């Protein structure tokens, strides 16, 4: 087994005091992102289910998720995200069936094609780093990255790097133990905010997607 430092990650579902608990436990706040992600869709959630996910973040800019294939034929060849408005403008027009003049920006197509904000919540990402220690002194520093949302959602992903597969159970069990103390060990293929929107309000619809989008970071002892 030679892949270098084995990034061992497992997923955890934390409570509402996680950030505080981490500070007190000794995890450092590496970085955190906070923004409201505003999702638009047609009235039927046709956009959502069409693999064209439309989101604006913090009123900064626009982001559209496309199934790789824009001339949708066949399966979804991965997701391609476009952030350039002119692309989204033209895309939204063809998506909703406009045939009209390209306005200028996405906010203009938004009002004109009359999309509805069907989902809006805040993404709270919080990256913590926890140094292991004990009688041995220096033990690995592992990262805990929290992904949370306004609509009842909190996930942590705990990732440590060991160069030895033999210390994987050691590091990984520390991970699970601290996590179970803080909340409950999870197992999902990492939910995006919208994956949460779905599991929260539309569980079977979430499953349609989940079963197909089942690719998340959680290996165990072998990254590769």
UniProtKB/Swiss-Prot annotation:
InterPro entries: CYTH-like_dom_sf (IPR033469), CYTH_domain (IPR023577), THTPA (IPR039582), ThTPase_euk (IPR012177). The modification N-acetylalanine is found at residue 2. The keyword Heme does not apply. Substrate binds at residues 11, 55, 57, 65, 125, 157, 193. Residues 5-201 form the CYTH domain. GO terms for molecular function: magnesium ion binding; thiamine triphosphate phosphatase activity. Binds 1 Mg(2+) ion per subunit. It is an enzyme of class 3 (hydrolase). Its cofactor is Mg(2+). Optimum pH is 7.5-9.5. GO terms for cellular component: cytosol. Mg(2+) binds at residues 7, 9, 145, 157, 159. Disulfide bonds: none annotated. Keywords: Acetylation, Cytoplasm, Hydrolase, Magnesium, Metal-binding. Belongs to the ThTPase family. PANTHER family: THIAMINE-TRIPHOSPHATASE. This is Thiamine-triphosphatase. It comes from Mus musculus (Mouse).
């Amino acid at each position: 087994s030679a892949q270098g430092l084995i990034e061992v990650e497992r997923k955890f579902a934390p409570g509402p005091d996680t950030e505080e608990r981490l500070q007190e436990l000794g995890a450092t706040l590496e970085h955190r992102v906070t923004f409201r992600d505003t999702y638009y869709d047609t009235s039927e959630l046709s956009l959502m289910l069409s693999d064209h996910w439309l989101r604006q973040r913090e009123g900064s800019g626009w982001e559209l998720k496309c199934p790789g294939v824009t001339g949708v034929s066949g399966p979804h060849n991965e997701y391609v995200e476009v952030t350039s408005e002119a692309a989204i403008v033209a895309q939204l027009f063809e998506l909703l069936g406009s045939g009209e003049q390209k306005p200028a920006g996405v906010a203009a197509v938004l009002g004109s094609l009359k999309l509805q904000e069907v989902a809006s919540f805040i993404t709270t990402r919080s990256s913590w780093k926890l140094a292991l220690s004990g009688a041995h002194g220096q033990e690995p520093q592992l990262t805990i990255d929290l992904d949370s949302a306004d609509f009842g959602y909190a996930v942590g992903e705990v990732e440590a790097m060991v160069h030895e597969k033999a210390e994987v159970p050691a590091a990984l069990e520390k991970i699970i133990t601290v996590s179970s103390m803080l909340g409950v060990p999870a197992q999902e293929e990492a939910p995006a905010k919208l994956m949460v929107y779905l599991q929260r309000f539309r569980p079977l619809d979430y499953q349609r997607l989940l079963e197909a989008a089942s690719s998340g970071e959680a290996t165990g002892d072998s990254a590769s």
